[PDB]
């Protein structure tokens, strides 16, 4: 029963890997990301709200921030789709930022705490 | 982490529950059944070929199937959701049947046929 449920969420991360059925695609600088927006939504508050804006039938076509670096986004919604304590190198300073730009999950911006206890 | 993906599968079956994001509306019987597409596509392999039939004609799943027990796809779609070999008091034939006309896990027609052969 459990297995069933990490093998039903990796099967839907190898779908979104792909591409199909594809409710949103989000491209914030030049690379494109694409995958279901329910799926950026139960993950990410930001794109939840996207959603309750999109309820009155608009097209979760497309999204865009600022200062938002896209390497992080990618980092990120791998992250959605993977596991814990996932440093894989990236600046603390942009994961943070994205994780507050996304409205993710505030153990990021713990981790970043974290961080700021390695250097000293 | 993988706790917070069973707990994530939760909460994208409450959403599913709920009714957000749904790319297909099937509905076999009277009922009428409301989800995502790729939730039903990730759990079914015919609604896998379904969907890339439907890839080149975005349209609503209205898939109907005769003889296959509306209760028993609702029971299909939370078990698959919940696994954990719930039976829930309805009769294994129409189980096991609409699992069958599904393609869904075999699991699901092995503990059908386990029950049927422990009587």
Same mark, same amino acid.
């Given at each position: 029963f459990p297995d069933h449920s990490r093998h039903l969420l990796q099967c839907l991360s190898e779908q979104?890997?792909? /591409? #199909?059925?594809?409710?949103?695609?989000?491209?914030? /600088?030049? $690379?494109? %990301? @694409? $995958?279901? @927006? !329910? &799926?950026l !939504?139960?993950?990410?508050?930001? #794109?939840?709200? %996207?959603?309750? =804006?999109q309820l009155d039938k608009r097209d979760?076509?497309?999204?865009?921030? =600022?200062?938002?670096?896209?390497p992080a986004f990618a980092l990120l919604l791998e992250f959605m789709y993977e596991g814990?304590?996932? %440093?894989?190198?990236?600046?603390?300073? =942009? &994961?943070? !930022? $994205? !994780?507050?730009y996304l409205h993710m999950y505030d153990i990021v911006k713990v981790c970043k705490k974290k961080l700021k206890e390695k250097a000293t």
């Open positions: 979104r890997h792909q /591409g #199909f059925l594809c409710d949103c695609t989000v491209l914030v /600088g030049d $690379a494109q %990301f @694409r $995958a279901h @927006r !329910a &799926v !939504a139960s993950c990410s508050m930001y #794109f939840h709200l %996207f959603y309750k =804006d979760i076509v497309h999204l865009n921030s =600022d200062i938002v670096t896209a814990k304590l996932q %440093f894989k190198d990236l600046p603390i300073e =942009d &994961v943070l !930022a $994205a !994780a507050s």
